[PDB]
Amino acid sequence: KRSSKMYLKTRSQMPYKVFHYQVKIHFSGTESNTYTNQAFEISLYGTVAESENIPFTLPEVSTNKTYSFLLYTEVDIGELLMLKLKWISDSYFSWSNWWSSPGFDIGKIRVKAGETQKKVIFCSREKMSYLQKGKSPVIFVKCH
Amino acid sequence: DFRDIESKFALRTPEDTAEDTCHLIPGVTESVANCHFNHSSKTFVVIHGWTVTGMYESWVPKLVAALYKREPDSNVIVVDWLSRAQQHYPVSAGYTKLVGQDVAKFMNWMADEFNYPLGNVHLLGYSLGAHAAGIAGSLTNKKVNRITGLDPAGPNFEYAEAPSRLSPDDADFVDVLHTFTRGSPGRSIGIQKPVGHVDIYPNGGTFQPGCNIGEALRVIAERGLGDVDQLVKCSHERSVHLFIDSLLNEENPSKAYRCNSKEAFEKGLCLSCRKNRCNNMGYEINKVRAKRSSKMYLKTRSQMPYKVFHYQVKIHFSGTESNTYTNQAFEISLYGTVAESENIPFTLPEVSTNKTYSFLLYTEVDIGELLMLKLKWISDSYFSWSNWWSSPGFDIGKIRVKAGETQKKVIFCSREKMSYLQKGKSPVIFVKCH
Amino acid sequence: KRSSKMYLKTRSQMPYKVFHYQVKIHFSGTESNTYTNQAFEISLYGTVAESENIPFTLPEVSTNKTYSFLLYTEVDIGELLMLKLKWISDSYFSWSNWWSSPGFDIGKIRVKAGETQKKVIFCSREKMSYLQKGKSPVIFVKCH
């Protein structure tokens, strides 16, 4: 009935044909000091191939609040089993490796497959999450 | 009362063993006429199991092709776990009840409209499918002849009861292939508690040979990323491969043996079957009822033919020197009238004197009868250091090997004086005697 | 004054000259079901090079008890910053990825450098340890 805009992404030149796996996060932690302009790095493994070090950005991070973003990969993955949620920093060295750095807690994750509508519910482990800056990622699995 | 099916029943044919062409919708009799269904012949029902992907596993086509090869002019039905099994694994455990109710309704509708004899249907069950069939049939009014499953699932089924898991009363006859049981009780994928009238525990269920370590690393290798995922699934598909191999090779079925425990079978004191024991395995299994759970054991080759023999042995060790030794490796070889093995080893600790021992041996080649034997005793001092000075030795008298498939108490027989078995020495020959 | 036995390890053939970094663990958890004949995999990173996937064995694992073992590496590392404490299993697939598998808690670690006597006190993070079977390792750092 009217103009219908559209959007997508693509690879560099040869095959194009990228996927879309937008994500939601139910951030819920204790410390309520809001932060902004922070870089989130995640990775995913599936049943055909796997990406390793794909980054993304999400400012205005808060608590007791849900966020979302768009992610793209350039390799077929089919289904997806586990996830990585590393949080990067510019203080790699052991200066910021002991003293209390800001951290949050992760509950569930609601990634949604693009080509096929799959509300797969990712699922933090019993207690082993406590996402923190300059720390190892937090694993997740299929659940529910 | 046929609108909550949500599980389409397919019907393949020998010319098409890959893609589902028909859809036998319950209640709607039109499908039966649409797709030929010989109401006189036997009809199997394959129930696959959980799949991370959204398609049938790679074994269904081979299974169905072999099924047609074995029993032509017989209908085959496949189910559509898909759309429900893709969900979380516990969700599939819950949905087993729904699928069982659905299958029971299907069979009841068939027995009402067409009164097809229930004594001519198999509920071939794999993975979760075995438990699905087991919970099924029980709701059926006229019971089911055979419910032969494959590798019944362990989780959420141990510490359960008949209504919630496969039970011997779920059908007239039942048999399972416990192809994997390694791990703690109640947490190993493969249920270890015996379920059917007769159960089969190839290799003891610890693992299977036709595979390797598998996953080299979490990221470098392919855990479930295809490739080495099948290798990781070393045994879970070995059940179906064994079943299809037995189905194809109807002439010479493998003879699994009945015993008391895996260790007892390894020792080899529980092979003779004068009574109704040591029944066949596979399609040609002999239908039998037991007063209780009846465990069984056997061995197998790597992947293709399987169908190995069993030639357990006894030794009447009797020597002079009385210094006991332990954890020693015995190597033997045998020659027959069809073929011969060369360098098959085995182990026997706690060796002593004036005492008789026994063990279990297996070979993977047909031999028929057996003429002579080798009894070499190996060492880790090959070089001429331990080639002269007196090394421990024993004396050998008679040998009482017993053929498995055919009960033959052939009495092997040492020569007049030419035995004196010794470490790091040539074997001792033996012959038929007495 | 008498016979004095000695011991060591070595590489395969060419350089030999391996190190020795024996370790102690102060296992302290809640669930008291003892386990035996389990395989522990650890890895370490330093200031010169790093090993990746060195395994070792430790049966008779219990709770509220301290254990120790001997580890060897075949590459110079100098100092050591962080540690890996993965616990391996023979149920890689997602069968044993959700339902509660046995797990323990890790406090401090008391590795001791061989060539130079250094009672470096490794140190679990605030709460992010909960070592569990078939799970990502637990990171550790220099501390105290």
Side-chain angles (χ1 to χ4, degrees), chain A residues 1-89 91-144, chain B residues 1-379 381-434, chain C residues 1-89 91-144:
Chain A
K1 326 305 160 291
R2 80 217 190 281
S3 53
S4 172
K5 301 271 282 296
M6 293 180 183
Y7 296 96
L8 74 165
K9 317 297 276 284
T10 179
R11 214 162 92 81
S12 63
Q13 67 294 323
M14 185 180 288
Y16 303 138
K17 188 269 183 181
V18 290
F19 296 75
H20 297 78
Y21 282 116
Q22 63 75 10
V23 176
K24 311 187 155 60
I25 295 90
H26 183 192
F27 267 110
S28 296
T30 70
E31 206 281 336
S32 313
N33 188 359
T34 318
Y35 319 120
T36 189
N37 184 43
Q38 290 286 39
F40 283 3
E41 191 295 345
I42 67 185
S43 195
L44 61 83
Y45 304 73
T47 184
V48 193
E50 76 302 351
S51 59
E52 297 289 357
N53 211 10
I54 191 69
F56 84 92
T57 55
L58 182 63
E60 74 259 3
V61 55
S62 75
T63 59
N64 199 356
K65 185 153 211 213
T66 189
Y67 295 65
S68 66
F69 64 91
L70 187 153
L71 173 143
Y72 83 94
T73 177
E74 74 285 17
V75 176
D76 189 358
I77 305 298
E79 300 290 357
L80 72 166
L81 282 73
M82 63 177 214
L83 212 60
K84 299 291 227 297
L85 194 63
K86 202 166 141 193
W87 189 29
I88 202 62
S89 188
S91 197
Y92 303 98
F93 214 73
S94 59
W95 318 116
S96 56
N97 273 1
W98 170 236
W99 56 254
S100 82
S101 294
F104 293 99
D105 189 359
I106 299 301
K108 299 174 176 288
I109 284 300
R110 296 291 192 80
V111 67
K112 177 168 171 77
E115 292 99 357
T116 180
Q117 316 311 333
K118 299 294 297 311
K119 269 67 68 169
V120 302
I121 297 169
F122 282 170
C123 194
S124 185
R125 305 272 280 193
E126 52 281 8
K127 75 176 80 169
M128 187 66 203
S129 75
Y130 191 75
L131 189 150
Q132 190 181 7
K133 186 134 170 184
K135 188 57 180 301
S136 163
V138 176
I139 311 309
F140 301 100
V141 299
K142 182 260 287 180
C143 183
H144 206 177
Chain B
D1 49 312
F2 300 85
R3 35 189 70 77
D4 271 10
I5 301 299
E6 291 296 80
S7 290
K8 312 253 199 165
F9 299 68
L11 189 152
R12 289 181 176 89
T13 48
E15 291 56 10
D16 57 347
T17 56
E19 183 178 1
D20 54 286
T21 64
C22 295
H23 293 88
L24 281 71
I25 312 315
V28 176
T29 314
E30 184 96 359
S31 307
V32 178
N34 280 326
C35 300
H36 274 302
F37 189 91
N38 192 343
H39 290 49
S40 80
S41 185
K42 242 187 176 182
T43 65
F44 302 91
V45 174
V46 71
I47 304 299
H48 65 279
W50 182 65
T51 288
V52 294
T53 69
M55 31 184 68
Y56 292 80
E57 284 216 288
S58 179
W59 57 262
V60 175
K62 301 203 279 283
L63 186 153
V64 66
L67 202 44
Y68 285 153
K69 290 290 297 309
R70 172 53 173 70
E71 181 172 89
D73 201 12
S74 66
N75 296 115
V76 168
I77 296 188
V78 185
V79 289
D80 269 307
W81 256 117
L82 281 291
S83 192
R84 258 203 276 277
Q86 272 289 51
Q87 207 58 4
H88 192 23
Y89 168 96
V91 176
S92 283
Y95 287 8
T96 189
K97 183 176 76 171
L98 302 197
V99 297
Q101 263 194 340
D102 183 88
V103 168
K105 280 190 184 299
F106 167 102
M107 295 297 278
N108 292 318
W109 159 94
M110 183 95 97
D112 189 340
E113 300 308 323
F114 296 92
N115 67 39
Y116 183 81
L118 280 296
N120 307 116
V121 298
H122 301 192
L123 296 183
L124 258 58
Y126 161 66
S127 180
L128 279 295
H131 289 262
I135 187 163
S138 61
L139 321 184
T140 311
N141 54 2
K142 299 308 307 191
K143 287 285 195 54
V144 176
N145 185 72
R146 172 169 285 95
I147 193 164
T148 292
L150 285 82
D151 189 350
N156 311 59
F157 294 127
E158 191 262 331
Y159 208 107
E161 310 91 301
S164 184
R165 69 133 168 86
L166 187 148
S167 75
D169 69 86
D170 291 331
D172 178 31
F173 181 97
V174 55
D175 52 4
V176 288
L177 277 285
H178 291 259
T179 319
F180 193 69
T181 181
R182 172 143 50 75
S184 72
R187 306 297 180 72
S188 298
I189 195 177
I191 190 70
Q192 46 167 351
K193 208 268 180 180
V195 298
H197 293 49
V198 306
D199 301 334
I200 301 299
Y201 284 59
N203 297 115
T206 62
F207 63 90
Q208 286 296 313
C211 64
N212 265 17
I213 184 173
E215 192 70 11
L217 192 53
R218 301 281 296 286
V219 306
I220 299 287
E222 281 86 39
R223 291 183 317 291
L225 279 297
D227 298 87
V228 72
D229 174 32
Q230 301 296 114
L231 268 52
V232 170
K233 299 299 98 183
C234 169
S235 58
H236 205 270
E237 285 178 87
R238 179 51 41 74
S239 179
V240 65
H241 272 303
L242 192 66
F243 200 81
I244 184 166
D245 191 358
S246 158
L247 202 65
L248 213 57
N249 287 339
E250 180 178 0
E251 190 277 331
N252 53 7
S254 309
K255 204 151 171 143
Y257 281 32
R258 159 159 168 80
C259 184
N260 191 11
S261 300
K262 71 182 60 151
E263 297 74 10
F265 174 66
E266 290 291 328
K267 276 294 149 286
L269 283 72
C270 59
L271 300 82
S272 79
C273 51
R274 301 283 327 178
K275 274 161 43 69
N276 223 333
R277 291 95 64 74
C278 82
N279 54 17
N280 285 359
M281 181 275 318
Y283 202 68
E284 304 293 354
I285 179 166
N286 266 315
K287 296 184 289 294
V288 176
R289 312 290 157 69
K291 326 305 160 291
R292 80 217 190 281
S293 53
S294 172
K295 301 271 282 297
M296 293 180 183
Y297 296 96
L298 74 165
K299 317 297 276 284
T300 179
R301 214 162 92 81
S302 63
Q303 67 294 323
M304 185 180 288
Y306 303 138
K307 188 269 183 181
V308 290
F309 296 75
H310 297 78
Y311 282 117
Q312 63 75 10
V313 176
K314 311 187 155 60
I315 295 90
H316 183 192
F317 267 110
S318 296
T320 70
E321 206 281 336
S322 313
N323 188 359
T324 318
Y325 319 120
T326 189
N327 184 43
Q328 290 286 39
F330 283 3
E331 191 295 345
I332 67 185
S333 195
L334 61 83
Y335 304 73
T337 184
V338 193
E340 76 302 351
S341 59
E342 297 289 357
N343 211 11
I344 191 69
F346 84 92
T347 55
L348 182 63
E350 74 259 3
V351 55
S352 75
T353 59
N354 199 356
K355 185 153 211 213
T356 189
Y357 295 65
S358 66
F359 64 91
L360 187 153
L361 173 143
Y362 83 94
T363 177
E364 74 285 17
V365 176
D366 188 358
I367 305 298
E369 300 290 357
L370 72 166
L371 282 73
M372 63 177 214
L373 212 60
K374 299 291 227 297
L375 194 63
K376 202 166 141 193
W377 189 29
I378 202 62
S379 188
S381 197
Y382 303 98
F383 214 73
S384 59
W385 318 116
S386 56
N387 273 1
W388 170 236
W389 56 254
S390 82
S391 294
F394 293 99
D395 189 358
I396 299 301
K398 299 174 176 288
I399 283 300
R400 296 291 192 80
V401 67
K402 177 168 171 77
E405 292 99 357
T406 180
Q407 316 311 334
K408 299 294 297 311
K409 269 67 68 169
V410 302
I411 297 169
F412 282 170
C413 194
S414 185
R415 305 272 280 193
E416 52 281 8
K417 75 176 80 169
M418 187 66 203
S419 75
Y420 191 75
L421 189 150
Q422 190 181 7
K423 187 134 170 184
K425 188 57 180 301
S426 163
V428 176
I429 311 309
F430 301 100
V431 299
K432 182 260 287 180
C433 183
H434 206 177
Chain C
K1 326 306 160 291
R2 80 217 190 281
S3 53
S4 172
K5 301 271 282 296
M6 293 180 183
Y7 296 96
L8 74 165
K9 317 297 275 284
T10 179
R11 214 162 92 81
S12 63
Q13 67 294 323
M14 185 180 288
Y16 303 138
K17 188 269 183 181
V18 290
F19 296 75
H20 297 78
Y21 282 117
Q22 63 74 10
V23 176
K24 311 187 155 60
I25 295 90
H26 183 192
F27 267 110
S28 296
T30 70
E31 206 281 336
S32 313
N33 188 359
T34 318
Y35 319 120
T36 189
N37 184 42
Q38 290 286 39
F40 283 3
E41 191 295 345
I42 67 185
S43 195
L44 61 83
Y45 304 73
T47 184
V48 193
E50 76 302 350
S51 59
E52 297 289 357
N53 211 10
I54 191 69
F56 84 92
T57 55
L58 182 62
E60 74 259 3
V61 55
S62 75
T63 59
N64 199 356
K65 185 153 211 213
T66 189
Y67 295 65
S68 66
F69 64 91
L70 187 153
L71 173 143
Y72 83 94
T73 177
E74 74 285 17
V75 176
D76 189 358
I77 306 298
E79 300 290 357
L80 72 166
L81 282 73
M82 63 177 214
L83 212 60
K84 299 291 227 297
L85 194 63
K86 202 166 141 193
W87 189 29
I88 202 62
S89 188
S91 197
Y92 303 98
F93 214 73
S94 59
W95 318 116
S96 56
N97 273 1
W98 170 236
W99 56 254
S100 82
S101 294
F104 293 99
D105 189 358
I106 299 301
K108 299 174 176 288
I109 284 300
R110 296 291 192 80
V111 67
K112 177 168 171 77
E115 292 99 357
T116 180
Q117 316 311 334
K118 299 294 297 311
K119 269 67 68 169
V120 302
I121 297 169
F122 282 170
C123 194
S124 185
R125 305 272 280 193
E126 52 281 8
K127 75 176 80 169
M128 187 66 203
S129 75
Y130 191 75
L131 188 150
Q132 190 181 7
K133 187 134 170 184
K135 188 57 180 301
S136 163
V138 176
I139 311 309
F140 301 100
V141 299
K142 182 260 287 180
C143 183
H144 206 177

